[PDB]
Amino acid sequence: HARSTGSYSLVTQQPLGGKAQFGGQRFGEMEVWALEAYGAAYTLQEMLTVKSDDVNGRTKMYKNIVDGNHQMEPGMPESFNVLLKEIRSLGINIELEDE
Amino acid sequence: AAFRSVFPIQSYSGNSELQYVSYRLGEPVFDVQECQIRGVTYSAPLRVKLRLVIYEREAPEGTVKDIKEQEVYMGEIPLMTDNGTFVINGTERVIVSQLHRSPGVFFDSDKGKTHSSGKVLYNARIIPYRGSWLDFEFDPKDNLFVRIDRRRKLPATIILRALNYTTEQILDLFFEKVIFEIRDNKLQMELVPERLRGE
Amino acid sequence: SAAVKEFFGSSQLSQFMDQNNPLSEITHKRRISALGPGGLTRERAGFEVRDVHPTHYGRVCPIETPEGPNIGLINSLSVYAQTNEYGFLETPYRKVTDGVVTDEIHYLSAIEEGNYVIAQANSNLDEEGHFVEDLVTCRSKGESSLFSRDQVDYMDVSTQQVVSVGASLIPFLEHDDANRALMGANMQRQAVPTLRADKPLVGTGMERAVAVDSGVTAVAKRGGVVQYVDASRIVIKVNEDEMYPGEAGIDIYNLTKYTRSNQNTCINQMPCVSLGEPVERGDVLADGPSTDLGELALGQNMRVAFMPWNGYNFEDSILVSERVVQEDRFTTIHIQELACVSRDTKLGPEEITADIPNVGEAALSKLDESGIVYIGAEVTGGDILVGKVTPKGETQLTPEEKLLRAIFGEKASDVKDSSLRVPNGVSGTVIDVQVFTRDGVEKDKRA
Amino acid sequence: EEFDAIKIALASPDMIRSWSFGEVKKPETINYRTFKPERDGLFCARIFGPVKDYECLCGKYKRLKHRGVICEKCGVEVTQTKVRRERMGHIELASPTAHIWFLKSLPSRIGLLLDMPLRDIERVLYFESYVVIEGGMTNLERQQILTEEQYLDALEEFGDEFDAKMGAEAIQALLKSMDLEQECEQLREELNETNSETKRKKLTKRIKLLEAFVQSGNKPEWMILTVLPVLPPDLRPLVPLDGGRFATSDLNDLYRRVINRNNRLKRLLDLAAPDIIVRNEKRMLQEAVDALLDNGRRGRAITGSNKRPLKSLADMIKGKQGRFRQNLLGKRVDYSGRSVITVGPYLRLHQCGLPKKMALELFKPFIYGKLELRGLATTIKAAKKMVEREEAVVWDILDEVIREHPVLLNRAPTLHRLGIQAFEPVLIEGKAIQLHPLVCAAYNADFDGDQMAVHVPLTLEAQLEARALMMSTNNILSPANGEPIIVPS
Amino acid sequence: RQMLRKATIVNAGSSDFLEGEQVEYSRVKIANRELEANGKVGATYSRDLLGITKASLATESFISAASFQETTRVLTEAAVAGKRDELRGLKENVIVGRLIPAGTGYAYHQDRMRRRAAG
Amino acid sequence: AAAQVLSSVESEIGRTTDPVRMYMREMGTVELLTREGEIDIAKRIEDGINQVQCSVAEYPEAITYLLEQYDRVEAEEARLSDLITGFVDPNAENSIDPELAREKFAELRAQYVVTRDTIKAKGRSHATAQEEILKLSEVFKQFRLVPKQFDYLVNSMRVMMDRVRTQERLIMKLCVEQCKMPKKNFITLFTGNETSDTWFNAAIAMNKPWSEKLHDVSEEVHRALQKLQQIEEETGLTIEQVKDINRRMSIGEAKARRAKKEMVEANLRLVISIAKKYTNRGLQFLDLIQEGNIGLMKAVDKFEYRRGYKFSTYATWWIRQAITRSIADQARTIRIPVHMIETINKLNRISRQMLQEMGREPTPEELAERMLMPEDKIRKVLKIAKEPISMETPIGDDEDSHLGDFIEDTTLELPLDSATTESLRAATHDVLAGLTAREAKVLRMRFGIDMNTDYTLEEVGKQFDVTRERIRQIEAKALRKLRHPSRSEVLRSFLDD
Amino acid sequence: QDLVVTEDDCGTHEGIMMTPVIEGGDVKEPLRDRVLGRVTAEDVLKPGTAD
RNA sequence: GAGU
DNA sequence: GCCGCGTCAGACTCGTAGGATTATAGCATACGTGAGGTGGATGTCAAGT
DNA sequence: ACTTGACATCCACCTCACGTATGCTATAATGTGTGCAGTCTGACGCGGC
Ligand SMILES: [Mg+2]
Ligand SMILES: [Zn+2]
């Protein structure tokens, strides 16, 4: 199964599963842990953001890769945005404290 | 089996009735390969000879009002293939045979289980084919509790109360009777030989 | 009819059969699950039911079952066992009337079996009479040990009565540990037939009964003499013995050629015997896919040297000769079935036509007037089989694209290319295309 | 963006009012023919934003030329559809309902704060029995259970001053009027006299709660909800499958039932219905809200059309297949591939066999960029079609990228950190990945049907950390035991 | 050591301890250093015991705790107190899609510390 | 006595959440009076409404408003609907003949003038005048306004009452909270004099050192009094004949209110029975009962005991209708109006017949035959027919995927395609540079690229200077440069686009 | 999770005594096996002609 | 089912 | 503290099959919305300036 | 380079048509639905006898 990029899930905006719909492989809790064992922050972040539910991140990083950059240019996983507002629909106050 | 269980189905009033005579299976309307191709389930038409029979209010049980007898259509029934398989929505499935615990009566033991004691708590589980279930299990204190439909525990004795049995009849059919006569000033018993063994 | 179609279609008990080989089919149908309606679930199952009961002897094969979660739940019915009217499993046993072994067969239920003392199948017998051994090897009351002739009520009908279908084919089963025995029976179910089916040279005598019962081959109903044989139909003239005088005695066998199974596997039936040969009732005429002259031909037998290679055969890795490819052994035919639907939205009725905006005429070429592939063309990944066109929605093109469009003026009409494309990384010849005409609107030229 | 910390707290009704941009009155979703949103409905574009980018309902206002302008006819402001991922709405419930979570789940902080046991409160809400709120007349105190005719004998003789009621409304009332400040003080004075150990323990925990409560600045009244915040549409989406069927989230159904009952409530209010029916309506209201938040955690679980209980908000978060485990502490990954592994005796320790076609796909963007730089591709569109034709140039460009690049090899299960390692990929034709034998022990892998995944460390930092830390060659000594990991088998 | 994360207070400073306070081990030393330099009242402690589930539920990260289990219970706990999470923890940053604050990112996350001291 | 059994079952209510039981028990307290008992309450309702109508007729302004409203619509030549359709619809214990209306208004005006003359001489109602005022009230009781018009009427008396009480409450704020004094004394003074200035200065007679201050805002004080006194002037009602009308109107209302309450309470079980008929796996069991209740309310208010029919028969209809309208109205994600619904219904009923006589299924043509409708209509109804499947639906027979896990989003374009869009914008801008100054300006403007606005041909002309179709040849000229294959080789790569 | 190397030496003197686990007959893990790579607290002695 |  | 009653858990990736359940009525008036029509704005053209 | 008139093709807003909303009916009719979930199990937690 070969996949760089393709179709995303509706709600979380993560890649779907399997070569069936040209889905991406899941990097799971366990898998995360491997990374964490090492000191690799940005690998992590790739997995977490540009390679998953970060739309801004994957698009602009694609552009930069093609141009010869290779940087991250970081953002926010849309899964988490999902989560916040879902807490808020439960009637619970969840928000970003400005630094 | 199903027909005679349902039939003959009599009206509430006790006057009209629908009676079951006999059935017939139409020879399969569309063949196997066609079913595969068109995504349909392979099935035969069922018809059943029913007789609509009307008794009278007026005449006592004069089964003599109307008889209309005819074959009513009950729908299409999935047929099994020659190899033991089925054709469902255009694809081959099989119905795998199934093991299960048979209806009847089971007497299980709680080996150790709960308690620090390891109190041997026996219980009878009654499973009928169709209907609610009965559970009779022992309290650690040796008391016999029932669970109707295994919900919550109460005394087995009260079940017999509901069955029209008073306290005395209950104590009779379970425990061992012993007759004690009062005469002059001394107590005599009607004694069974095997009763005092090992005392 | 709703309740019925829910039982057949939606029940867990009604499942896709494995048709990879006749074995998988055969076995799969006689597998028995403790699950489903009125039965245990996965969480519902503790140590209790997953573990092996000694009474499984002669009734369920103790070594057939999926590993991991399903283990202990689903087992195969052992060979000779069958159900009484009430749905209790009985196993056939030989009566031993006070010392002497009769030819009388008695089928016993489990609880009845516990009561009587049964000798092992391997125990030694004397010429149609009594036992060899004064102290014989016997089971009873669930237990196993040594017992005398006088108490001996019955005996095992045959050795193979312990085990189900898959396990019975394994010849040297006595020398194989159960861990691997288990997996062996499982693996057999997953074996794909090659076009060039070979009979097992190392077998069990079993291989004839398996194939015959699977019903993937063609078998003679009456027998007689074979009058005309085609790779499509075989017609046989029956002998006067079996032939009824009123009707005609010409027997009809239509042959299934190169047909697609559920698992994509091929089922092709080839004729074995020769024209004008005599065969009798129940002889095997045409071989099914993984079948030889009546025998289960699940696979192929090759020259294997046990030995280490320069790290190529490392951890159960496998090293093979070019010759395998060369001879086309272990080449398998797979049929994939693929569909394209023409529906009508309120956005517009979709049409099946050869009309495709902005594609190379190279690709257009394989299509006819109706938009249909020419039957028998060899196709590759990316290539289109069936033309379909769909009403495109509203798109506000950036001023850039208006400019662009104006410049070349290319005839871009609001239409999305719906046509059914060929799979990536899979290619080959189309055999047969099918048409489904709706009644109201008339059929396309290809239809 | 740049923020530092998150505070989680109670939802003020006016805080919901703050975020919430409009009121969802209608149970309607969208129009049956024109699949666009209904006016004041659940998918209404007037509230949550336009369906399509910078284009309203009725279609008078189009293009980026309008940004924040308000469509005069249909009431659609013009901007990105994407706002439906963030705009929250609100439902005005006429009967303030209980928050389920603070009731049914332990400890149930309402109960704790007011030192009220559960069933008594229950019967109060369910409208089984009345409760004592606040009487000038010491006839009764706080928080006493009274059934029907227990209430009757009292008022008939008293009334006037005597203040008690039933249900959620009563609770909220009792909550606003209760002097949290004074109680804190009184409890310290209770400690000032007898400080018996058991009594002092529970007295300790109770004062803890009250003190933290006004430290956070939270009002208990908020416990009961008047305004219900309603989730953005995109999060409760409704779309059509290709077969013509539609699928929609279950939250939409729960919300629907909610406003049905709420709006029947409004009707029954206006029409001055009997109290029996009012109550019935409120229990149902209570019910609907509570199954919305947490289904099954109340009475009998609300069933899907199927058989299965319907999955509410909480379910989405909590479940193992909820948001945490599925979307947060792990996600689905880009630039990845997978297939069967096969031994590569010729491989060096730092090498892995990588199937041509797999690496192809992964490195796609890299290929495109380098195509354009070499000028062998005029632009990126042609670059794509250049790779998809499969010419010889494609392999050489890919060849230059693979040089000095590592790829990541995953294998489940993730035992320890070497279950994922970085390797220099060695292209071969064929669809099998080739694995070095000595590192079999680190992956605990063996050749008989195991598959490995693959990923692309994408940035320069990715590449660096993979070669530096993650190389098989770099980490041979076990973090587990001091001994070697990679060892002859 | 993670299981020794929290302890039992006997006696306060001028802050809000008292008998049977259930506070973090580190917060205890906090109070110590602070107040014993001024005098006032130093608090006594004894370390207590959290096994696995307990320890998890103890931590000053409700996001981390909510990611574990008993999400329902957890979250209301948090909600009630108005708990604040400063993103010290790992899974914290995981879930925020941010810079894990170990090694590679530890440097960046310690930088945010002095950014909190100055603007 | 029924109040007894509620309590014992409440005492054993093992927390009974199932609202069915709760509801069943409460209704189970109240019993059912049949036959004439129903008519008892029905007659009380009549009396309550009658009482309230009597009160309306007793007031000057109500009749004034009646005549003036008629005159408004009527003056506009000869209007048909609108205001005229709102009024009228009279029940004489609908086409209203011209001759009758002409005459019916005549004696009204005459009555007005005579009843004013009487009031003025001697008293408001000295003996004979009291007889005549009650006679005029009997005049008005004879007609039956439809609820529509009646309701605006009730509110205006209602409203004016509220004005009086509300102004008092505004004054009560500052007086009650800011000052303070014993309530007892007030009664006599206010009741006795009302109109004159004697209690003004007589109040000062009691002395007490806290009475001197009050002059600083004395101007504001009595001037504010103006507002409330003006209420008096506009209404023009006498002190004795004001309370009586209000009190007694409230009486009429309460009688009717509580009466209908009793009626409603009494018929519960009938509603439930009818509701449980359509429980059967469609909608929610308890839901049914709710809107059934609303149908019962309808039955209450519209049921006339005069018709002499049994109550159950008539009520059946209103509850039935409420249920059906509610089912069709609410139920579905997609609301379906009536005609649609009815047609669906027809469909399935005939479907059974057809299936059973054909042997299998009715093809769209065959079904359409029996319906007497067009085939494409039937086909499109079948399409619209099927309802939404849950997004959380376990599509995996093993709770593996919840539909959402299959879901592709067409709105998000790929990063690959983003590069597509972006690259051509870049190329377009660079190609723009090659054109001559004013030409470049023209094309920039016209297409709006690199400009906020996309100016059309005419707009470009206005800004440029007059030129109309000149810029059309500018279009063609720019087209010439760009048609140049040399300049557009990259742009030619987007030919396959 | 949060337990990470933040300072390199806090300078505590206190620490635990590790023995050779000679459990029963065999010395299943000796001193070196348990102790290797560990940071040490305290001065280890044993008196002699010089200490 | 596959495998770890 | 002992039973007991109640709650919350029970790994990681990937591969492959298809969808539903029901039994219902009808209508007449009124009031508003969406679709298509009609004229204006704007493009297109051929000389003509 | 730039204007004018004539014509075609297009974009906006109004007027009419079909869809939707609610009320009316009259032999009498008034307490019931429906579950399948379950049994594995050592634990930690709240309450009570
Ligand atoms: Mg092996
Ligand atoms: Zn608009």
Say whether the peptide bond before residue B45 is cis (omega within 30 degrees of 0). Answer: no
What's the CA gap between D242 and C341, in Å, rounded? 10
CB distance F65 to F156 below 8 Å: yes
CB distance C418 to C371 below 8 Å: no
Q: Is strand J less than 7 A from the beta carbon of F124? A: no
Coil, helix or strand for E79? helix
Q: Output the DSSP codes for F24-44.
A: HHHHHHS----THHHHHHHHH
Tokens coding D117: 């046991």
Q: Which residues contact B35 (CB under 8 A, 6 or more apart)?
A: B41, B42, B87, B90
Coil, helix or strand for F490? helix
For C251-257, which contacts have Cβ atoms below 8 Å and span 24 or more sequence positions? C251/C220, C251/C221, C251/C222, C251/C224, C253/C218, C253/C285, C253/C286, C255/C218, C255/C230, C255/C231, C255/C286, C257/C231, C257/C232
CB distance A7 to A21 below 8 Å: yes
Coil, helix or strand for D431? coil
Count the Cβ atoms, other than its own, within 10 Å of residue A31: 24
- DSSP label at residue C131: B
How buried is F197 (Cβ within 10 angstroms: 0-12 exposed, 13-18 middle, 19+ buried)?
Answer: exposed
Any F CB within 8 A of A64 CB: no
Question: In this complex, which of A11, A55, A62 lies closest to F404 when CB atoms are compared?
Answer: A11
Q: Which of residues 322-381 of D touch F (CB under 8 A)?
A: 364-365, 368, 378-381
Q: Is strand J less than 7 A from the beta carbon of D3? A: no
Any C CB within 8 A of B2 CB: no
End-to-end CA distance of chain B: 58
CB distance B121 to B113 below 8 Å: yes
Q: Which residues contact D458 (CB under 8 A, 6 or more apart)?
A: A46, A50, A51, A61, A65, A70, D335
What's the CA gap between D142 and D119, in Å, rounded? 16
CATH 1.20.120.450 fits C331-441, yes or no: no
**Protein CA at A48 to nucleotide C1' at H1, angstroms:** 31
Radius of gyration of chain F (CA): 39
Name which of C4, C35, C38 is nearest B2 in CA terms. C4
What's the CA gap between F432 and F205, in Å, rounded? 99
What's the CA gap between A19 and D339, in Å, rounded? 11
Among protein residues, the one whose C-alpha sits closest to the C1' atom of J47 is D117
- Using CA atoms, how far residue D471 sits from A29, B117, D418, D465, D474, in Å, is 22, 58, 9, 9, 5
What phi, psi does B180 have (nearest 5°)?
A: -125, 110
Coil, helix or strand for D470? helix
What's the CA gap between F282 and F338, in Å, rounded? 18
What's the CA gap between B10 and D369, in Å, rounded? 83
Q: Which residues contact C362 (CB under 8 A, 6 or more apart)?
A: none
What's the CA gap between E54 and E67, in Å, rounded? 14
Does G23 show up as a binding residue in the annotation?
Answer: no
Name which of D348, D345, D370 is nearest D424 in CA terms. D348
Q: Which of residues 3-22 of A touch F (CB under 8 A)?
A: 5-11, 13, 16-17, 21
Q: Output the DSSP codes for E21-38.
A: EEEEHHHHHHHHHHHHHH
Taken in order C229, C235, C237, C238, the sign of the CA dihedral is positive
B and C touch per CB criterion (3+ pairs under 8 A): yes
Tokens coding C198: 């070979």
Name which of D276, B100, B176 is nearest F29 in CA terms. D276
- DSSP label at residue D324: I
Tokens coding D304: 């899907």
**Protein CA at C399 to nucleotide C1' at I37, angstroms:** 30
CB distance D406 to D470 below 8 Å: yes
What's the CA gap between D195 and D197, in Å, rounded? 6
The letter for the amino acid at D369 is G
Tokens coding D221: 């009244």
What's the CA gap between D41 and D47, in Å, rounded? 9
What phi, psi does B66 have (nearest 5°)?
A: -135, 145
For E41-46, which contacts have Cβ atoms below 8 Å and span 24 or more sequence positions? E41/E11, E41/E12, E41/E13, E41/E14, E42/E13, E43/E9, E43/E10, E43/E11, E43/E12, E43/E13, E43/E15, E43/E17, E44/E9, E44/E10, E44/E11, E45/E7, E45/E8, E45/E9, E45/E10, E46/E7, E46/E8, E46/E10
Q: What is the resolution of this structure in A?
A: 6.0
Q: Encode chain A in three state secondary structure.
A: CEECCCCECCCCCCECCCHHHCCCCEECHHHHHHHHHCCCHHHHHHHHHHHHHCHHHHHHHHHHHHHCCCCCCCCCCHHHHHHHHHHHHCCEEEEEEEC
- DSSP label at residue E99: -
How buried is D439 (Cβ within 10 angstroms: 0-12 exposed, 13-18 middle, 19+ buried)?
Answer: buried
Q: Which residues contact F147 (CB under 8 A, 6 or more apart)?
A: none
Tokens coding D189: 């004075």
What's the CA gap between F312 and F271, in Å, rounded? 10
The letter for the amino acid at B137 is E
CB distance D420 to D411 below 8 Å: yes
Tokens coding B61: 């049980």
Tell me the shortest Cα–Cα distance from F191 to chain A, in angstroms. 55
Interface test with D, best of F389, F391, F489 (most D CBs within 10 A): F391
CB distance E34 to E17 below 8 Å: no
Tokens coding F32: 């059912």
Is F415 in Cβ contact with D365 (below 8 Å)?
yes
Strands (E) across D194-318 are located at 224-230, 238-240, 246-248
What's the CA gap between D294 and D119, in Å, rounded? 19
The letter for the amino acid at B186 is K
Angle between helices C399-408 and F415-433 (to 10 degrees): 70
Burial track C42-60 (b if 16+ CB lie within 10 A, e otherwise): eeebeeeeeeeeeeebbbb
What's the CA gap between F69 and F80, in Å, rounded? 15
Name which of A53, C169, F302, E113 is nearest D323 in CA terms. A53
Is D379 in Cβ contact with F494 (below 8 Å)?
yes
What's the CA gap between D375 and D395, in Å, rounded? 16
Q: Using the mean position of ligand 2's atoms as its centre, give its distance from the Cα of residue D21 in Å.
A: 19
Pseudo-torsion of CA C233, C238, C244, C246, nearest 10°?
A: 60
Coil, helix or strand for D170? helix
Q: Using the mean position of ligand 1's atoms as its centre, give its distance from the Cα of residue D329 in Å.
A: 34
What's the CA gap between B42 and B89, in Å, rounded? 8
Half-sphere exposure in the Cβ direction for F186 (13 Å, CA): 5
Tokens coding F217: 């805002």
Q: Which residues contact D451 (CB under 8 A, 6 or more apart)?
A: D338, D339, D340, D341
Q: Output the DSSP codes for C66-107.
A: -SGGGTTTEEEEPTT-EE-TTS-EEEEEEEEETTEEEEEEEE
Q: Is strand J less than 7 A from the beta carbon of B133? A: yes
- Using CA atoms, how far residue F14 sits from D120, D144, F21, G9, in Å, is 12, 19, 11, 63
CB distance E72 to D101 below 8 Å: yes
* Nearest ligand, CA D448: 1
Size of interface B-C (CB pairs under 8 A): 77
What's the CA gap between D422 and D191, in Å, rounded? 64
Radius of gyration of chain C (CA): 30
Half-sphere exposure in the Cβ direction for G26 (13 Å, CA): 2
Give alpha helix (H) positions in chain E.
25-38, 53-58, 62-68, 71-81, 90-96, 103-117
Question: Which DSSP helix (H) or strand (E) runs through B133?
Answer: none
Does D242 show up as a binding residue in the annotation?
Answer: no
Is C315 in Cβ contact with D437 (below 8 Å)?
yes
Instruction: Give contacts of F383 with chain D, Cβ < 8 Å.
Output: 244
Confirm whether C78-158 and C216-290 share one CATH topology: no
Tokens coding D133: 């709120």
Name which of D296, D113, D78, D315 is nearest D216 in CA terms. D113
Is A76 in Cβ contact with E97 (below 8 Å)?
yes
What's the CA gap between B43 and C4, in Å, rounded? 11
Question: In this complex, which of C314, C343, C382 lies closest to D447 when CB atoms are compared?
Answer: C314
Q: Using the mean position of ligand 2's atoms as its centre, give its distance from the Cα of residue D55 in Å.
A: 8
Name which of D408, D428, D382 is nearest D469 in CA terms. D408
Tell me the shortest Cα–Cα distance from B87 to chain C, in angstroms. 9
- DSSP label at residue B88: E
What phi, psi does D487 have (nearest 5°)?
A: -150, 145
CA angle F375/F380/F383 to nearest 5° reads 130
Coil, helix or strand for B186? strand
Give alpha helix (H) positions in F142-284.
147-178, 186-192, 198-203, 218-235, 240-266, 268-277
Question: In this complex, which of C314, C316, C345 lies closest to D437 when CB atoms are compared?
Answer: C314
Strands (E) across D224-295 are located at 224-230, 238-240, 246-248
Q: Which of residues 12-71 of F touch D (CB under 8 A)?
A: 13, 15, 17-19, 22-23, 26-27
Q: For the domain C78-158, what is the CATH code?
A: 2.30.150.10
What's the CA gap between D466 and E21, in Å, rounded? 47
Instruction: Give contacts of D311 with chain F, Cβ < 8 Å.
Output: 392, 402
Coil, helix or strand for B17? strand
Chain breaks in chain C (C to N over 2.5 A) after: none
What's the CA gap between C23 and C189, in Å, rounded? 6
**Protein CA at C172 to nucleotide C1' at I13, angstroms:** 36
Tell me the shortest Cα–Cα distance from E100 to chain D, in angstroms. 12
The letter for the amino acid at D410 is N
CB distance C64 to C76 below 8 Å: yes
Burial track F438-447 (b if 16+ CB lie within 10 A, e otherwise): ebebbbbbbb
CB distance D166 to D129 below 8 Å: yes
- Domain limits of chain A? 14-99
CATH 2.40.50.100 fits C216-290, yes or no: yes
Q: Which residues contact D181 (CB under 8 A, 6 or more apart)?
A: D214
What's the CA gap between F180 and F182, in Å, rounded? 7
CB distance E48 to E82 below 8 Å: no
* Strand H footprint nucleotides (protein C-beta < 7 Å): 1-4
Q: Encode F260-321 in three state secondary structure.
A: HHHHHHHCHHHHHHHHHHCCCCCCCHHHHHHHHHHHHHHHHHHCCHHHCCCHHHHHHHHHHH
Question: In this complex, which of F334, F392, F452 lies closest to D249 when CB atoms are compared?
Answer: F392
